[PDB]
Structures are given as C-alpha cells and as structure tokens.
Amino acid sequence: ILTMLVEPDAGKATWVAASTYGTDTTTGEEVKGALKEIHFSTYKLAAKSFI
Amino acid sequence: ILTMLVEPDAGKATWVAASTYGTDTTTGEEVKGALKEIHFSTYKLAAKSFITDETEEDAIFSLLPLLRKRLIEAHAVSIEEAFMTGDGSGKPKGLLTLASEDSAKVVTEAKADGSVLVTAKTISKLRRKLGRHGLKLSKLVLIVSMDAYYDLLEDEEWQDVAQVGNDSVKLQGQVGRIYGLPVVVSEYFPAKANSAEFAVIVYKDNFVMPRQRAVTVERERQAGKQRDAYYVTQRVNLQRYFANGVVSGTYAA
Amino acid sequence: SAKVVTEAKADGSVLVTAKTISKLRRKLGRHGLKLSKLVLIVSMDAYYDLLEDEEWQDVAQVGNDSVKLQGQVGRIYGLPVVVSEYFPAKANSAEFAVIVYK
Amino acid sequence: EDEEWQDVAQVGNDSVKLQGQVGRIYGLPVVVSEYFPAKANSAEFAVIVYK
Amino acid sequence: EDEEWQDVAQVGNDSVKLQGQVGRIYGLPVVVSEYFPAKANSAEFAVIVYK
Amino acid sequence: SSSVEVSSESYETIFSQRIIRDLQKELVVGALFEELPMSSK
Amino acid sequence: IDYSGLRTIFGEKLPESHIFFATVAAHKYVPSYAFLRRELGLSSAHTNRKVWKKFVEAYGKAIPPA
After folding, report:
1. CA-based, 20 to 30 A from B171: which of A11, B220, D27, E12?
2. How many CB atoms lie within 10 A of CB A24?
3. B10 contacts F25 by C-beta, under 8 angstroms
C-alpha cells in the first residue's frame, strides 16, 4: 500500500479583529486542518510459456 | 489613514451677453471649486495554530510546515475572497460587492440552469456600465467565473476561424481573448444561481491595497501549556480612488 | 460520476461530433480549465466521426487544418487527439472518449 | 447598404465596413450624378452607356 | 448572376462583384458566342468539345 | 488608539497632497474646426 | 424565410443551391446568400454550405404537418 496524506481544504483567515487591538482577539480564530491519507496498492499480472 | 485630495468637478463659464460688456458682469460667474478628500484605512487579518510539544513527538511526521502553509494560505484565501465579495462591514468591500452598491450588477441574459450560457457578448456588454471608465481597453481586467469560462469556450460565436481568427475554439480550445479584453478565470465568484455573478471588469488603476503591516509570524512558546503558538497577523484593505470603476454581471433572475 | 451521457447516438443518427467531445471538459471541473494538462483518447469510430464532423470540415470553419483539405483531425478544441481502440464496443451506453488529468 | 458588398468575404479589402465608398460594382466603375430624374415611381437610377 | 461566383470567400480575387467577367468556370476557359440556337425550349446554351 | 501612549487625531493620517481627479469627459467638438480671425464685429 | 411560399415553387425537396438561387421564382421569396444568411442569423463567417444546410433543415423541419 501507499498512504499519502492530502492537505485538507483552505482554512480562511479572521478578517475582522477590528477595534480590539491589543486584546486576545486580534489574533484570529484558529485556521485548522486534518490531513487525509489515501491508500495505493498494486495488482499482479503474469503470463507463462514453455519452449 | 491616508488622505489624498480629489480635485473638484468642472464648472462652466457664463456666456455673457451684450447687455453687460462694461457691467462687472461682463466677466461672468465665479468658477469656485473645493478640493474634496479621499480617505484610506486598514482592516486586520489573523490566525492561530497551536502545535503541542507532545504531538510532534507522538506522530511520525513533523506537521510544522503545514501550520505555516495553512496560515499564509488562509490569509490569501480570505483576502482573495474578501476582495471579491466583502461585506464591507468589517472586511474589505469587494469587486463584486462594490459593483452591487454602485448599481452596476448588470443582470444579463445568461441563465442559470444552462439554457442561455454565458456568451462572450453577455460578458463584454458589461463594459457599458463602467462608463467613460471604459473605452481605453488596455486598462481593464476581466475575471470570469469558471463556469463562465467553460461556457465561453462552447460559445458558438468564437469557434469558426472566420469568426474569430486562428484563435477559434474549434481549432484551439482556450478562449483567451474576448472582444479585446484579456480573459482570466477565477473560481471565487459566487456559485451559479439566479442572479449571482459571473464576471467583473474592474478598472485596475482605481484600486489600491492600503497596507500597514505585512504577513509576519510570531512563535510564542507557551510553556505551562506546552504548546508553541504561531500567531501570524496581517493588515490590508481594498479601496477605490473613485466610486465608479467596476461592473459585474449576473446570471438572469 | 463522470459518464456524461452525450447525445451522440449509436447507429449513425448523430455521430460523435467534435463539440461533444469538448463539452465533456466541464465535468472535469476546476481541474479542466488549464488545457495543457489533459489527454483525449477517442475510440477509433469516433475518430472517423470526428472527421465527418461538419465542424472541422472547412478551411473557414477551421483553418488550414480543415479536413477536406487535410484529412486527419489532429486537434479538437484545443485538445490533442490520440486514437485507441481498446474502448468498449460501440453499443448503448459505451464510451467514446475520456479526458484524463494526467 | 447593399448587404451584398458589405463584408470582407462578400468582397475584398474594398468592403464597405472597412472602407465606405463602393467604388467598383461588379467590374464597372461607379460614378455618381445627381442629374438622374428625381426619385419617383418609375424614374431612372442608372444608365450604362456605351461610350 | 450565378449566386455562386459572386464572393471573394467563395471564389477568389476573381469574384464577380469584385470583377464582373466570369472568365473561368470550374477550370474551363469561358468563351461566349451568340450563334447558338435561339433561346427557346430545348435549344442549346453550351458545348464542351474535345478539341 | 487602544494602547497606552495614544496620540491625538490627525496624527494618525498622512494627508497626501496628491490631487487626484477622475476620468473627466473628453472634449471633442471644440478643437476640430478652423478659425476665422475676425478683427471686427 | 418564407418556407411556405417556397413550397409552391418547389414541393417537398429543395433543389441544389445553384438552382434554388437561380430560379427567378424563388428570388423574390429569398434573394442571394445575403438574405438567406441574415435570416438564419448566420454570418458571412459561416461558410455557405453551412448556411444552406441550415436552410434545408428549416425547410424540412417546417414542412406542413401531414
């Protein structure tokens, strides 16, 4: 198998913040995400002969 | 704030008649103008990520680049979206939202549910609203929604080589120029619906991005909670020198 | 869910006209628009119907690349055309084309 | 306003939209005079003499 | 007045509107004579001999 | 301005003196023609 | 445009392009590719067989229902 992560979708950034500068809220809400693993695998194909 | 002054609008001069000539009125009516002002300002943008020290140990891979990528992408995503469609209340008013205010969302024949398609003409016809802010043609940009771009390729109008040139769709496939405007596709228009928006024809020179701070990263190890917080903050807006300048199209209602 | 069903019919009637082939790009989605990152594999009997397409047929409708003048539709609507025969047999449903994001 | 002579595929670099004066019609030079009888029913609009 | 020969995108620089004398039809030279039998039913308007 | 050490207004603006005006309708019918330098009424 | 009137001149099937335009009778109902093309909303940019083929289809599509 091959499990490769996929970076999740776009978070978006807290646009406002506004008057509150210096308070905790100026840094905005968390932009967060979860990586999504996706598996890969290989099937086997063969042929045979007899000389 | 940055305030620039806008020159006052033109004032006509009286056509003085013969009666006057030596009457103090022979010189007409005073042309008085007041230098108006334009004010610019900024709106913040922000993000927090926390990586607990325990996790980096817990998991196999690092996870650190992702936090950074996410935050910077988020500022871009938000800015790109905001600039397109912003409430204006706290976020930058946007090309789509500015047009609506200026009564420039031109409802067009293009139809939601297929049926009419967004043909090139429907997109070029938007230029009329721009007004004089329109004729030059090398100072304009066209941003069409992805669905429009796709509809623009299937426009029967641009495919025929004796209909457009060696640039016809049949022959080429990528409608690159519509009626003298470059075509650039973005997908951050509102999604297809009755009304909604498929295209804007901003008059670029009118818009400036007032800055004040640019994307910076500050890591604040918060021991006692064992996290290291990356707080990336940024402050910018999109404002227009003058009220006119963008005209947007809408699918028909 | 990308088996767009085109109107082209089996047993003559319509032929798979060229336009039908590039209509399909829309269902690709965002991935579709770029156009230099796609490949078109058409069934052999949809290359013989891309020729009889009324559209690619005229030095005017197209360019110096028109069929009467040349004979091999090499480009359809901005996509390269590559012919393979392994597609299933023409019949109802069936497939005449696919356009992968390589 | 002859729909016939107006395009550049209905004629050449001599088309009206592009140029504005139909100078040649079907191989004849075109010369305009205002001395033709006044426009009316019947009347005459062209004479193709033999010089 | 064959609608067929009268365009520059239909024929070439040899189109009627532009020129006025159909001199070549489909690869044959055109020579006009007026001793063909009088126009009438049946009658003849053209001959194409193997000289 | 939300911090200790504030400064009065007008101190947070740069007041550019760039005077910008708009597109301003173009004038075409005045200059095209020629003049008859009249020297009498 | 006047497919109906043309039916009197040419019944079901339309003759080939050369003859249709040639016929004096049809000239009035449709004169030259200028008229046919403008009526179809086609352009000089569309090649004439495309304009004719479209005209022929209209002639059939429109044919009296029977």
Report:
1. E12
2. 6
3. no
